[PDB]
Amino acid sequence: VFEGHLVGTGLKVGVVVGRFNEFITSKLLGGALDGLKRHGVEENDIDVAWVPGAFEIPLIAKKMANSGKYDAVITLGTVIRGATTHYDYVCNEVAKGVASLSLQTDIPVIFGVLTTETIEQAIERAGTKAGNKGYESAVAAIEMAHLSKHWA
Amino acid sequence: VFEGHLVGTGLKVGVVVGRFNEFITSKLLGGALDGLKRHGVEENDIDVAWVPGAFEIPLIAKKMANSGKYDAVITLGTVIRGATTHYDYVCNEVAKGVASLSLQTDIPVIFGVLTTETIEQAIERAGTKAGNKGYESAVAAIEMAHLSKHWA
Amino acid sequence: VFEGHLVGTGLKVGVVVGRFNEFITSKLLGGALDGLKRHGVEENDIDVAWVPGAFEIPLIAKKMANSGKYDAVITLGTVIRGATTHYDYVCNEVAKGVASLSLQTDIPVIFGVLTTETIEQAIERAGTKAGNKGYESAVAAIEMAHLSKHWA
Amino acid sequence: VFEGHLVGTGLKVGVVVGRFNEFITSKLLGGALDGLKRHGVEENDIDVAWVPGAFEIPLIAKKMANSGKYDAVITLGTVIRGATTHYDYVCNEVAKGVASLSLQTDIPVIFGVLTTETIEQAIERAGTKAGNKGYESAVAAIEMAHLSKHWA
Amino acid sequence: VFEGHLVGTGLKVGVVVGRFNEFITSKLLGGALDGLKRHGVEENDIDVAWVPGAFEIPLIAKKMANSGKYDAVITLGTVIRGATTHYDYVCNEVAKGVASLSLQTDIPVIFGVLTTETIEQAIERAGTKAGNKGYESAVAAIEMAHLSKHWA
Amino acid sequence: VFEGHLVGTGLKVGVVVGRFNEFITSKLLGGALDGLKRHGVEENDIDVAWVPGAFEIPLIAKKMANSGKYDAVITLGTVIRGATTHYDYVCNEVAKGVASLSLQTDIPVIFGVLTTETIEQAIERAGTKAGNKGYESAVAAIEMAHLSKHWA
Amino acid sequence: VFEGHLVGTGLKVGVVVGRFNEFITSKLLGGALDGLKRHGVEENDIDVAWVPGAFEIPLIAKKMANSGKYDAVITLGTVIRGATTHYDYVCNEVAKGVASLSLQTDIPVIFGVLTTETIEQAIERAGTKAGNKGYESAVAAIEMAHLSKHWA
Amino acid sequence: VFEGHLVGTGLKVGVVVGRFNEFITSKLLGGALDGLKRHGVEENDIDVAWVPGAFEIPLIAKKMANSGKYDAVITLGTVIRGATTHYDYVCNEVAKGVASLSLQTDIPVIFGVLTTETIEQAIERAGTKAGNKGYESAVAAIEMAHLSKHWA
Amino acid sequence: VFEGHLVGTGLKVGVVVGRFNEFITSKLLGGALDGLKRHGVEENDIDVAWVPGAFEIPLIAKKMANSGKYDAVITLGTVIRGATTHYDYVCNEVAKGVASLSLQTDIPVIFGVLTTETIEQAIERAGTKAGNKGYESAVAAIEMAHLSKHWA
Amino acid sequence: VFEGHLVGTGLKVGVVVGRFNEFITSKLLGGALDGLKRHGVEENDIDVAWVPGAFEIPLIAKKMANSGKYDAVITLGTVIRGATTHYDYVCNEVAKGVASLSLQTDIPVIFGVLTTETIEQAIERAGTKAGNKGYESAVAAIEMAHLSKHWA
């Protein structure tokens, strides 16, 4: 009874990508832009905020949701396993932040941060075998934008 | 003593299903009808919201309980182990959302999200030798909503 | 040196028991509902709230503490390992809502939910080798109750 | 399309439980005698017939269906592997008299007799991991009852 | 509720024993007396029919229940695994007879035929560490006959 | 030839059950308190004495036989192997006071205390594979009672 | 029915502890106070007798129950496996004394002597993951003394 | 630059200790005395709150620091690995509570709860090889107290 | 509240040593005498009775306790493992006798009989690595003499 | 009773550090500052003496404490295993000197010389996992200083 439209010609999205692991987040962003752009979203109704890395993505995502300028916010980034458990707390707090601070703002905030073990797994999901996580995040932002933003 | 009825003659239930793994969630939403319906709930008093996937189920599950139109909100979806720990942060936040944000609404929000390791296990719990976890999550939904009398 | 009493001559206790795994939670309730009685708490001053299972125990346990009718609330239930990580998110959220979440009320909420690996392990704490964890969770309730500092 | 109802507001149910392995059949009966109650079937409109064990359940189950006092009869019992093939002939004849033999009456007779290998397996269906097969056999009774075509 | 007495003060029981394996069935018929007798049944109200072996126990067990002289008919005998599958077809038909032809008589016909793999197992169940299956089949006989009140 | 009766129409029985391992002793008592009832012993002529555990069963069992109010006293309890030899001294002293120590009274005292190795073994005699040893210990009580020679 | 209170408001308990293994018996006597005390027993109504070791605990435990000053006598101590069978004859006689000489006094003498194989096991049962066997032996002491009403 | 003082002459401290694992938490509380004492704090100018389990610490640690009574609150307790994952949900929520609810008050709440795998590891950190983690959490408490200083 | 004095200047002890294994009992006695002597006991208030071996030590120990001349009796001896189980019954009856016949006389009778496996274990405990069991028995007799003989 | 104070406000301390293994002894001297400082001692009211090797410490540790300049002298240094037994004669004589020649002066001389096998073990005890054994030897110095007290 309540499906979400997938055409976002009149939408207005804003994304926050993490500079760390640029090698991956780059192609990850281009896929999200390409997605929104070719789904109707105007090529300039789209803003991008570069943060130091995923840990920083919850703070600035909240600053773009509370700015009340966008119809949806897309969080992009990439985290890869290291030698320490540092990778765990980062990955957690990013999702923990993006998810929890997506209800505090009743604004669709799509979580599109890669959390992998191998550099080959990131590439795998940045426009390779698995597809482009970024593009898939945009197509998700548009849908949420029809079901969650202008819907109440 | 404070048991809860199982006859939902005059209840209004709202369901939120994730499209990802539709192969499972589809026959898992078969717990809605042939479940709520056979227990009394009216065909028309049941609304369904399709979200992109489990991560987006806390937000829309909120904007359905807060609409005050439903006595209880059933949350459906399916998540299966990948190669990355991405599966973990998702399952966590879905459960973390449906739970921690079921106390802020005082409205019963039944957690019926399959979190499995195999496609086979998801099938085992969607109408096979474990039964349908969508039908069971409805029975629980009725009882819960029907148990909120020492409330208000 | 502020310690807690242990005789509950005039106490008002409320219990929330999960129906799932009734085979265990049954004897588990009888442990508390017989530890309270024999500790001087009235057999007629105890209320029991049957919820579907543990995941629903935070919600109903809240509406009993917020009910402002009990000095302490005991939460009884049983969760046993499955084949999926479903077991983890359940245990977590139960021992998370019940767990310290319920500090908000400032009513004692004793966490007495069995979280085991084997049906044989749960049966060990259900009134066997390790003793009845329901009885022990009632003794904890009386003690917690008899601890009075109030915020104001 | 002739399907079956599931609310049993005005139902007349009869139960035949085998005393042997009372440790299991006990909780097994409580499953049906609590699934019926909470499904709207009268706590005062249920009769229970204790037979020595399963082998005698076909005979007494017959004199209850032939009694023409119940819309459906539930058969509860438990049989566990021994060292001899004695277990086989018992299980067979129970799930043979009860089983389709009792078509002659045209009164619904639900076969809810546990036939397992381990005491731990029977304890799994007695209200644990696999759920209470007595509760499920009561839900089946209500449904079967609410299926009315009559031969004449 | 429909339990069955265990005092057979004024009952009339008829027993049918197979000669084959007399070594076992003999001390197995010791369940008749020192069983029925000690439970009240009169010494004289007990008749015994010796048949060639178990296969011939359905026929003669029939011409004893149909004589309407006995409140219940106890069937005794012993069968042990051979080298051929002959053991199977025998045990089957004995149980198949005593059961399927206990509904056509409405008179309780207790099945007390040992079906084992070892001479040792037959002994285990004729008055050794498993007890006497003839004495147990009498206790059941009394209760059964004593339970046929919602009959006729 | 002085043998013992088995119908206890007019009997006065007393039972001492150990609370420890209530999970087993529970069903274990129900075995005796249902074997007595169905053997013609009054449901209203049975007293039960709950002691901490088996070690205390000799003392309280004494004050019931010395009470001179019962024809026989049944002792129910359960003790299971631990990591220490503590289990041995308990079992010993229970089956030593209860055991023949209580010849002094000349009142029948039936030793029905389970002394096993596994929780699964105790559960076997608690009304499963091996039968209910409480029921059997009641049948022994009635028989012992019906044995009258008196010293004087 | 003859249960026993757990509130020892007006009881007089006497404890007998063995010095040997003071490292364990010390924190094991911590079951006396913070045990009897928290259950009601008066600080002053509790006397303690220090004996050389467990072997000397039957004699002095006798000259405390026979003084008729205490409602119940708690016996504490610890014994651990050596290289010789000396450990056996000790544990035996301690238990043999406290038991067999608790019927000659009619006064509840709770046996709370640790009989273990490891220093670690003694610790496990003196306030670690098994709890404090001194506190448990007090709870039992209260109930026992509080259960001697069908006495005298 | 803002270092924290270590001489706590004029300080009011509050301690919350868990009764479970008293064998360890006892000597662990020995960190309060012979700890706060020698650092200047006034003899019993410090209050100690005994709570049942480590799980109950967060609640009472609050209702002490909640309203100005102390300049800093210390939490002491011990938790040791069991067979079940119960150990995890306890440890987590204790640390979770003491930490998360040390920001809401703004009054220094030092986390001093031992979380070990072995009883030998608890002893290892209760005054053994690693020192006393109670005396160390006291030093921390004083330093943190002297850091309520704000900034310039 | 009831500790035992350790100075026995005015005491009057008597011991019974077993001649068998003189090689050990010798140094075992000298340690007991040396102990009593250097603890105050007058060097002539001390008597020694040589019995054939440990089995004989219960009889003559009773003859020295019933002689009402001593303040305590010390039983010394040594038993070592042989090829037969003879060693077991001897060791048992000695302790069984000394302990049981220490309550029949309400007179402190210290059990100091070595019960070992190796000749090297006896020497080990006769004034070697483990100390002198005899000396330790005297220091025990003196204490019991203050708590048990002139105390009542 | 004579405990040692821990607040060293008005204290003069002297430190002798070894230059060899400066990489470790450096951070080890960090125990002086941020150690004596926070315990009350006045900023650079403490003198530091740098000596070539740990072997030269005893001499200069003397010619400092030798004549009243400080209330206590701390010796810091590090020695790590080599291929030769040279490591032993150094460690020994350092400890030998600092100890033996701490009685002749009577002025507290705390021994704080690391004697490890690995460079990783030195780091382990220089501010890592085990803490800083320099800050610990400072606490000791203050306490020992406050114990120049003599006796009454």
Author numbering:
A (entry chain AE), B (entry chain AA), C (entry chain AB), D (entry chain AL), E (entry chain AK), F (entry chain AV), ...: 2 to 153
Provide text from the study.
Riboflavin is essential in all organisms as a precursor for flavocoenzymes. More specifically, LS catalyzes the condensation of 5-amino-6-ribityl­amino-2,4(1H,3H)-pyrimidinedione with 3,4-dihydroxy­butanone 4-phosphate (compound 2), affording 6,7-dimethyl-8-ribityllumazine (compound 3), and riboflavin synthase catalyzes the dismutation of two molecules of compound 3 to form one molecule each of riboflavin (compound 4) and compound 1. Catalysis occurs in equivalent active sites, which are located at the interfaces of adjacent subunits in the pentamers. Owing to the absence of the riboflavin-biosynthesis pathway in animals, the enzymes of the pathway are potential targets for anti-infective therapy and riboflavin-biosynthesis inhibitors should be exempt from target-related toxicity.
The BaLS monomer is comprised of 153 amino acids and shows the typical α/β/α-sandwich topology of known LS orthologues. The N-terminus of each subunit forms an extra β-strand extending to the β-sheet of the adjacent subunit. The symmetry-related α3 helices of each pentameric ensemble of icosahedral BaLS surround a central channel. The central part of the channel wall is formed by the side chains of five Lys97 residues, creating a positively charged patch whose charge is compensated by the side chains of Glu94. 12 pentameric blocks make up one icosahedral particle with a diameter of about 157 Å, which is rather similar to the previously determined sizes of icosahedral LSs [160 Å for LS from S. oleracea, 154 Å for LS from A. aeolicus and 156 Å for LS from B. subtilis]. The characteristic icosahedral ionic contacts described in detail by Zhang et al. are well conserved in the BaLS structure, although there is one fewer positively charged Arg residue compared with LS from the hyperthermophilic bacterium A. aeolicus. BaLS was crystallized from phosphate buffer. In the resulting structure, we found electron-density peaks at the 5σ level in each of the 90 active sites in the asymmetric unit. These densities were interpreted and refined as inorganic phosphate ions. The binding mode of the phosphate ion found in the BaLS structure is very similar to the phosphate-binding modes described in published LS structures.
